[PDB]
Paper text:
The small heat-shock protein (sHsp)4 chaperones play important roles in the cell by preventing aggregation of destabilized proteins (1–3). There are three structurally and functionally distinct regions in an sHsp subunit: (i) the conserved α-crystallin domain (ACD) that defines the family of sHsps and is shared by all members; (ii) the C-terminal region (CTR), with a conserved (I/V)X(I/V) motif; and (iii) the N-terminal region (NTR), which differs considerably in length and composition between the different sHsps. In this study, we describe [name], a chloroplast-localized sHsp, which has a long NTR (82 amino acids) with conserved methionine residues that are important for substrate binding and scavenging of reactive oxygen species. In [name], the NTR contains a unique set of methionines in an amphipathic α-helix motif.
Numbering used by the authors:
A (entry chain G), D (entry chain J), E (entry chain I), G (entry chain C), J (entry chain D), K (entry chain A): 42 to 184
B (entry chain H), C (entry chain K), F (entry chain L), H (entry chain E), I (entry chain B), L (entry chain F): 83 to 184
The structure:
């Protein structure tokens, strides 16, 4: 499950990937990435103030809504699908698309009724409405 | 990104492109110097809209046609972020494949 | 650069930062989404003054607090080019270490 | 023969070097480049509309016109030469220059009389006049 | 002793690191850098016209003037020190600081009385006053 | 790029540079701090003219002279995209080479 | 399925592993061996004249007959099993044993009733009776 | 092959060996120089019997006991191709492990 | 060393071997378990005679015949340090190759 | 201090080098061996029943007894020395000998008076007398 | 030219390959071996007392005497040849044989009339008769 | 192991060997084919005696003399596990070395 909070990624954070985790296993010796299957669909995520109206696009060119699914399980988002197989005289109109599933941990449990998904122009969008918060106001210090 | 394919009817470039976020206005197909050319530029879209992958720029692809290709009968289609170019061969000749199939 | 430490009284981020050449004005500590945030920007100083190391830019760090941390009792101190953040634990519990010492 | 049409180079093209050819032999295990001998003379090529008035410069500092040759064979351009050897008290005025030959496939057969070559300031220029063409007009599509 | 004149570093110079020295030992197989100990204190050097009023800062955050020393030996600058060890309940405030010594060859012998060192804000500064010179005027050539 | 050579008469920097596309105006030779300096900038030329290789910028080289070099007798020549600097030694001393030659 | 006839292994054979197959993929970049799971049980195979009374031993020290299975599917032998998990105060009496399945292609379809399997001393044995054949007599040539 | 384990009651060498195809006659356990020793030789068996793995030879393992181990209370068991040696500690002390389990 | 070849008439193993220093007595060709087998041993020769390369031993090669090969019509020839085995196919079928040749 | 009991070496022992220690740091990235300095003097050790009458030879060809020292510190053996430097017209009669010190942990504290060292034929010998023990008798088990 | 005296090979000799030459260029980065072309014909050399009646065999299976040549140039032996190309229906009877030339420096100039070459059984032999010598008698020392 | 040295008086092989545990009986020095040869065999010694390093075997080294070396004036000495061979040059010629020494 992608989790943006998770210590494993580099941001400016505590973990700092460059530390023990990146230095320890700089080679990817062992389990595969699944980077082949997620190359099928690159997806971002933006958080707006009103929503994780998930600015989660995914690029599935030539995909039909029967072949994709948006689910929530454990209150976590799931994206999965696969382009149809080739017909006898299929115009590929592509490189190999297949089998992928991606999961993103939302910061809060979503209302499943509030989430909208649309597919247009080969692009899924998924909207997650979030609750209104002041956000924890950030106090300032002086030098 | 662009695959090279062969059909019996046609190749040269039985090509695709992965053009996602392009308008057909922004794309040009052409044959110059008897070589296929696909060019264009990526623009911007809605701030509501996301993309993970490569960034935006101009882009511009050049393919050596057979000297005896039908340059006149070239077609290009764009659907769902892909371009497909078709160059008709002077003679339809499928590659024969002898695979055991009933 | 930022180390993670544990004390008995406190961790979450018993953090430092190496902030050299920052003013406390230029720094922000915060908890947003219940995550610690340290951000700011490096400015310029006297042309009499030298620095070997990384350059200047904005900078901005994000740390997962325990859900049961004292967000209210967070403190931050800056002295001599370092920041120190302290997050009080809900219960002081030292890691016990049984080392042979008299 | 350098050929700008050739599938082996990366441009945006069909071949796409990053595919099978670059992935297959990412190491240069086998035949040498000749990259040592072509380092003698780096040469570009520009095509103007009027001509492949070959905007083919080559950098041969300290070279004499006896030592260089411009030939056309198979209607293909050839550049070759080598700086003279060292005299007893030669002022090098250099690093090692030696033995090179480069060939560029022209898109059309050149008229050998029409080609001009000049050497000045340590720079060869070679001009190839081409035939007048409308060029294949590029049709536009709409979205 | 860092020496900016020294052939080993890359500048535009005669040596040119990329030559025999860098190509010969591109791997650091053998003696250690001391790059661990100098990471303790990164220090620049600027030369102003009035002085090598050494624009030599060093970053020693949390250091006391007892722990650092500025010396001149052989008329060469020396920087050395180490942050104190940990007390029982020391607030770190750090990563591991320890044991370093750096030396810079001055272009001229310094007057030891003229050099000033200050420590403020975790930053040493060291000033070396130099003698007044016209500098060797640079003659210009025409093309 | 710049080679270091020795002659009997002279070295220090019996140097070249590969300066192609430079005017002698754009070049400076100097001794500063008793060190040789070669600097300059590359400009533009005719659009009729081609170059494969590195791009244009400023450039600026620094060579440690022997303390007993003839700084006064330094000469620099530029021909066909190269600079040659000569620093006369205080004493002509060829490196002896005993090679079997008649 | 291990198959001793298969071109992939080195024997003196046609394939000769050292050829294209071994030279092509000398690194094991890609799919895992399953060499971890088969290390659980190393098993030989001997063929006697009377039988592939399979001189197929397997070393499963501390294994119970509930945990192992001998099956024939597609008329191919199958060995599989896994030592029980740890009890609360289990004397390991081991390193990690787990999950394995090995398959051997028999040269002929076996009579499933004729095969015997025994487990004793931590050793499975499996016997496959084969049909009587003259064997293809080997003709001799003279020099 | 031989693992080192700890129990509360005992370690030193809470050892195994993978001894497959050994008889308990062919094995010796001992403490010499106050160090544990496991040695023996592999023999032959029935030609009906198979083994894939390492070959046969002598073999002979040496383990540093705590100076305060019960050398007297050492036990060794062999079952199904493994040896297990147990050295009683002078004091049973489990390593404490604070894992969240109900 | 042994190459696999195909002819129209025959393959299975249209094999060679590099057998140098073997007598045809020392070689056996056979089909056992319907698999081709080539075996033999290298002997010694005249001390006047030299060989650079691999040493002497037994040797013994095993090839999977098509189930529908002519086992009966197998032939083997030895000349000048090579063996050639021929297995007749049940049907002569050349691989077709469409290469541009007049 | 070489210690034959030490877990780091491979024997048949508990540690088993091939485990975590050898797999973890199979490359010698970090501290040097001192394998250069101990190449000066290769030394074995045999234990006889009567003594670690240390069958510790060391090969110091051309060495003088002034240049070598045998010491016991912490009741541990020490060997150290270095062949003399070169005289003006020294017959080398060698490759570079220099600076080494080796230490071996004895299983028991030695009586320093009882140890003999001799140098002959370029060979040090050192004898350590040990105390008489029954040795822990080895009990036998039956199958 | 193979020369058995040459410092480059390992024997017990002065050079000792393991020294500077082998350590310097342990990788074969640069010129090719020609080890591909000499694999065509592996050839030994034995020296008998009567002759370098060159116990130089070469393995050329299927070769004709037209295709091989034995020459002496500079009084050095030369072996060269290549199996004929493929006929239309050639029984290969082989792997690719082609283009090779090997040269061996004889310790003395040979009488070209005295050398015999024979080809039989796919084996060249070449005999070089040498002059009679006492050989330099080897003096013995005592210990 | 064997170093090559040069003196003014002599080289060819101003050689050593590391011969430890050899008797001068077991060693032969010779010139054969005008090449230096050092050979011999290692034997056994006292069981009281230790050696760490390489094992025992025959050994046998071959060095190309200058054609104009004094083969007659070759000397060999063995002391403390080394052999030293000296081949006198036809003319004493030191390599000159111009190093700054007073």
């Amino acid at each position: 499950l992608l989790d943006p909070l998770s210590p494993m990624r580099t941001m400016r954070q505590m973990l700092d990937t460059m530390d023990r985790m990146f230095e320890d296993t700089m080679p990817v010796s062992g389990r595969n990435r699944g980077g082949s299957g997620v190359s099928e669909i690159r997806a971002p995520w933006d958080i707006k103030e009103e929503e994780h109206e998930i600015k989660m696009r995914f690029d599935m060119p030539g995909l039909s809504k029967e072949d994709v699914k948006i689910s929530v399980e454990d209150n976590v988002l799931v994206i999965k699908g696969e382009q149809k197989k080739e017909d006898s005289d299929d115009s590929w109109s592509g490189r190999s698309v297949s089998s992928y599933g991606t999961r993103l941990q939302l910061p809060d449990n979503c209302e499943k009724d509030k989430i909208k998904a649309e597919l247009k122009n080969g692009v899924l969008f998924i909207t997650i409405p979030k609750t209104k918060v002041e956000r924890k106001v950030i106090d300032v210090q002086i030098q | 990104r662009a695959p090279w394919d062969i059909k019996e009817e046609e190749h040269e470039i039985k090509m695709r492109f992965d053009m996602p976020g392009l308008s057909k206005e922004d794309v040009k197909i052409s044959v110059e110097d008897n070589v296929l050319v696909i060019k264009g530029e990526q623009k911007k879209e809605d701030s509501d809209d996301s993309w993970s992958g490569r960034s935006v720029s101009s882009y511009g692809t050049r393919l050596q046609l057979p000297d005896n290709c039908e340059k006149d009968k070239i077609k290009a289609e764009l659907k769902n972020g892909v371009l497909f170019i078709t160059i008709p061969k002077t003679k339809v000749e499928r590659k024969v494949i002898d695979v055991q199939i009933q």
